[PDB]
């Protein structure tokens, strides 16, 4: 039966005997727990290092994928020759190991990357101090903690103890977490800032409303867990920020799901608080928790403020964006249908401005390149699969019009860049406005109360041919030409060719208008930057293939690369004669040339050692003026060796004598640059 409530619990036996245990067993032979410490004070190491010191909460709060310290006191000193125990974390009334809701934590010699385990780091008298590491994919929620000692007759378990209940939150500081955000200032504003600013007014008369998110206030964390309980969200999916944010967009509005906030626009707001009176999220959520019924009343910005609290509270980085001239598409055709004005036939509408949320996560369900900011909206406007909810829609997918990737991207696109279509019905299309919708999209700046124009993340600039091509793509995701591109043998440090191929199998001559967008992506699939954008025209003679090779120079991307970065390419082309649109996106990993560094001889910090740097020419071309640099602050003054030429696929070796002058775990770094290939590196750790 479903396990969908954090508040519900099961009863874990304290004496889990097995088989027909004879009378008069002496269980005294085995360890028992006399006390557990979680070092959970808000001044102490766990909460400070886990960035949870701010919650008004007396229990331990930690973030997944990061280790924390606890201490277990036993009746006698733990002896691993005779004793075997394990820590357990448990959530729900129906915990299951294969569902992630019964989590046995083995005592291990060494913690391992991304796996639950506990390591003894200190022993004294009858106590052992443990460093516990949780999985970075762990379920978010309030866990019950037990210690289980194994005996030949069964398990001996600590009894229920709410003082050791432990909250595990999303971890933007953990690089193995789906919500990893590698910028501390960004983590401060989008996670730990509990006040903020929401923009409204008009494009030319822009107003500021302050908002208290209050995600650390007493009761709020518990309320957000209760929101998910009220949604009957299966616990096993609450470690997935896609599911958590999609549930949030449904549950924060009261339609369909008995959520938090009733919307009203009727200028009267009978028997409730009028939307403009709220100043923060705390009174709303806490009243929802206590009354267990929807709160009255909100509009766009209140929905987004309360949603922002939910996200940040759980650890999902989040911000509120404001779209000026926000379209409302009633028929899911991705344009504004304005009948000529006939107010009875015309069903679509435009808001002076609208508010919604962005949540930061990878998109493991989407192709590489669509992670990062996801638009999520809790203001009820349109049904998404029978419920009032919206998103996560990848802002990157919206920008290039790839609204085929879930969730609700066509709707969000229509909100930001739909055309106005003036229509006359009769016994006929009369005008087209392509700049009215979404004139400006903003969000609070980092470290201040001012605006940040972020329109360019959602759409290309009005009037640019790319804006048109992305919209035509958007409309196509709802003529006998084939289009494809391949990246011709791309090596890090060298230029390379992007070969876009059109095959015209018809007897017609076509003209093509097209753009290309080349991007750097983290290996987790989050986008980093566009480094090259071109629009170009080409004629397509009949019964012919045609390659258009695009040169991508090293200087265009080398200045923005990161470890394990891949490249993400968009190409969109319109057959002008047919208005047909061909759109493709592909990602590719750069080939990475190697530099191996060895050390011959002893590495004592007094005598001489020999550093062998090896490079192999990865290209079919001849490298020339190959400079090779060696750096190593404790081992060598910086040095360089030159090579006038390295023939194709040839290998050079460089021996360097060094006298290290410091002891410890230092490091050697090598670099190569030539007339063509440049800035390829190698590294080696060395102890002295």
């Amino acid at each position: 039966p479903p396990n969908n409530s954090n508040a519900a619990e099961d009863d874990l036996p304290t004496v889990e005997l097995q088989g027909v245990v004879p009378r008069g067993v002496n269980l005294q032979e085995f360890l028992n727990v006399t006390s557990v410490h979680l070092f959970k004070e808000r001044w102490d190491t766990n909460k400070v290092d886990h960035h949870t010191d701010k919650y008004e909460n007396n229990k331990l709060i930690v973030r997944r994928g990061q280790s924390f310290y606890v201490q277990i006191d036993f009746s006698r000193p733990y002896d691993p020759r005779r004793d075997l125990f394990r820590v357990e974390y448990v959530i729900g009334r129906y915990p299951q190991e294969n569902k992630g809701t019964y989590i046995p934590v083995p005592i291990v010699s060494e913690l391992q990357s991304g796996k639950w385990g506990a390591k003894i780091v200190m022993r004294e008298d009858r106590s052992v101090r443990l460093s516990i590491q949780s999985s970075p994919k762990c379920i978010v929620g309030k866990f019950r903690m037990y210690v289980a000692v194994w005996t030949p007759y069964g398990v001996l378990r600590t009894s229920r103890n709410p003082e050791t209940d432990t909250y595990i939150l999303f971890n933007p500081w953990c690089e193995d977490d789906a919500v990893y955000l590698d910028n501390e200032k960004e983590r401060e504003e989008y996670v730990l800032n509990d006040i903020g600013v929401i923009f409204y007014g008009e494009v030319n008369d822009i107003k500021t409303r302050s908002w208290s998110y209050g995600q650390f206030e007493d009761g709020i964390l518990d309320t957000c867990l209760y929101v998910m309980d009220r949604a009957q969200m299966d616990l096993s999916g609450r470690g997935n920020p896609i599911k958590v944010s999609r549930v949030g967009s449904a549950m924060v509005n009261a339609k369909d799901d008995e959520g938090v906030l009733v919307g009203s626009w009727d200028n009267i707001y009978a028997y409730g608080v009028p939307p403009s009176a709220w100043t923060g999220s705390v009174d709303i959520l806490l009243e929802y928790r206590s009354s267990e019924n929807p709160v009255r009343y909100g509009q766009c910005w209140v929905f987004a403020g309360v949603f922002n609290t939910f996200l940040r509270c759980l650890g999902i980085p989040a911000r509120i964006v404001t779209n000026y001239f926000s379209a409302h598409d009633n028929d899911a055709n991705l344009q504004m249908d304005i009948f000529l004005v006939n107010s009875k036939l015309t069903k679509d509408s435009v808001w002076n401005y609208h508010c919604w949320n962005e949540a930061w996560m990878t998109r493991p369900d989407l192709p590489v390149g669509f992670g990062g900011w996801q638009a999520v909206d809790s203001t009820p406007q349109e049904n998404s699969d029978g419920m009032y909810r919206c998103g996560p829609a990848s802002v990157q997918a919206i920008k290039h019009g790839h609204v085929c990737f879930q969730f609700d991207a066509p709707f969000v696109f229509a909100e930001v860049n739909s055309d106005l279509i003036y229509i006359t019905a009769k016994k006929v299309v009369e005008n087209v406005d392509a700049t009215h919708i979404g004139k400006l999209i903003v969000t609070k700046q980092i470290g201040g109360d001012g605006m940040m124009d972020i329109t360019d993340t959602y759409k290309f600039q009005e009037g640019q041919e790319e804006e048109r091509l992305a919209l035509e793509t958007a409309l196509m995701y709802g003529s006998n030409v084939d289009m494809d591109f391949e990246v011709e043998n791309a090596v890090l440090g060298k230029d390379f060719k992007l070969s876009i191929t059109f095959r015209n199998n018809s007897h017609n001559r076509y003209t093509i208008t097209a753009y290309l967008s080349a991007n750097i992506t983290f290996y987790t699939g989050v986008p980093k930057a566009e480094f090259k954008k071109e629009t170009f025209d080409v004629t397509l003679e009949p019964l012919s293939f045609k390659k258009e090779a695009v040169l991508i120079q090293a200087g265009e991307y080398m200045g923005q690369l990161l470890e394990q970065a891949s490249l993400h390419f968009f190409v969109t082309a319109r057959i002008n004669e047919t208005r047909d649109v061909l759109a493709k996106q592909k990602s590719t990993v750069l080939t990475i040339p190697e530099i191996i560094i060895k050390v011959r001889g002893t590495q004592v910090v007094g005598s001489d050692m020999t550093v062998i740097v090896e490079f192999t020419n990865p290209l079919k071309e001849t490298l020339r003026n190959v400079w090779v640099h060696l750096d190593g602050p404790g081992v060598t003054r910086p040095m360089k060796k030159m090579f006038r030429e390295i023939r194709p696929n040839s290998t050079v070796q460089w021996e360097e004598v060094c006298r290290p002058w410091v002891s410890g775990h230092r490091k050697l770094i090598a670099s190569m640059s030539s007339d063509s290939l440049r800035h390829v590196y190698g590294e080696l750790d060395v102890q002295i």
Binding site: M336, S349, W351, N352, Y353, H354, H436
Partner: peptide, 7 residues
């Protein structure tokens, strides 16, 4: 939040 009339 207001609905704006079509221009």
């Amino acid at each position: 939040x207001l609905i704006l009339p079509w221009p």
